[PDB]
Design a protein around this ligand. Structure first.
Ligand SMILES: [Cl-]
Length: 276
């Protein structure tokens, strides 16, 4: 049975509000992390062309005994593959590596404004969705203006905008902008690559609730109304990370975590980053 509730996307598909990402995991690590997550009820798995581990994700899914329709699989289009024709080819290649007939969500990994191809990538992805290769399509690291360009030029609104989001960079404005466009915010790096795990405000709250710092950080993120991707969780951590639905952070503690916001971005800059 599933360990997290789901949120409804603007195309009426549903998506688990908590899932496992496998960025920077080796093939063996990826298989083990996915297997461990599926075993404790995680049903969203988040990978990418760029992580080099879609085949390993595919192996773990194939071995899991979990029915395909109960799984939500996300993968991502790398910037060199952006283009009307090339992004359709890239989608099929990801499916082949995953050993799947479809993915539940296909994301443009970065807008890469200097490259200037992301609108044509989206045009291709609209065809990939029409053909059933991706049931939903969305974006990652997009600004409000990037999303408005997609809507204005292709008439299709992303289902999800997956962005860096944690208390040092709480994305208040972009959260509101996503919502205004009916786009779900999906947070990644919710622990700021671990930099927040020994933050005095975070550890004080964790002590008060008798939870871990990661549980506090994940719960805060969920209570903002975001979907969340747990980053590359080790098998020994994933059950703990998913045990975040049996408590609620009071307003004063949400406010305290809100006060940590200081614009610290630990991943790349959406405005300028043109790599993978
Ligand atoms: Cl993180």
């Amino acid at each position: 049975a599933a360990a997290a509730p789901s949120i409804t996307l603007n195309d009426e598909h549903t998506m688990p509000v908590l899932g496992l990402g496998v960025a920077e995991l080796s093939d063996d690590e990826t298989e083990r992390a996915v297997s461990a997550a599926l075993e404790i009820g995680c049903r969203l798995i988040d990978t990418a062309y760029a992580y080099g581990n879609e085949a390993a994700v595919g192996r773990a899914i194939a071995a899991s005994g979990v029915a395909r329709e109960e799984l939500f699989v996300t993968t991502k289009l790398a910037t060199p593959d952006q283009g009307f024709t090339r992004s359709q080819e890239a989608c099929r290649a990801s499916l082949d590596r995953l050993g799947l007939d479809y993915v539940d969500l296909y994301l443009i990994h970065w807008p890469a404004p200097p490259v200037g191809k992301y609108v044509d990538a989206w045009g291709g992805m609209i065809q990939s969705r029409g053909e059933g290769h991706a049931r939903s399509i969305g974006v990652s690291n997009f600004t409000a203006e990037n999303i408005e360009n997609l809507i204005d030029l292709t008439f299709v609104t992303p289902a999800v905008n997956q962005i860096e989001l944690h208390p040092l960079l709480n994305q208040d404005e972009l959260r509101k902008a996503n919502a205004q466009h009916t786009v779900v915010t999906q947070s990644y790096c919710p622990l700021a690559l671990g930099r927040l795990l020994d933050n005095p405000t975070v550890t004080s709250i964790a002590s008060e609730y008798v939870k871990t710092p990661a549980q506090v950080l994940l719960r805060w993120n969920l209570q903002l109304g975001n979907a969340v991707v747990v980053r590359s969780a080790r098998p020994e951590r994933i059950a703990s990370n998913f045990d975040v639905f049996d408590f609620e952070l009071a307003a004063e503690h949400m406010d305290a975590l809100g006060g940590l916001n200081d614009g610290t971005r630990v991943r790349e800059d959406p405005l300028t980053y043109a790599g993978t």
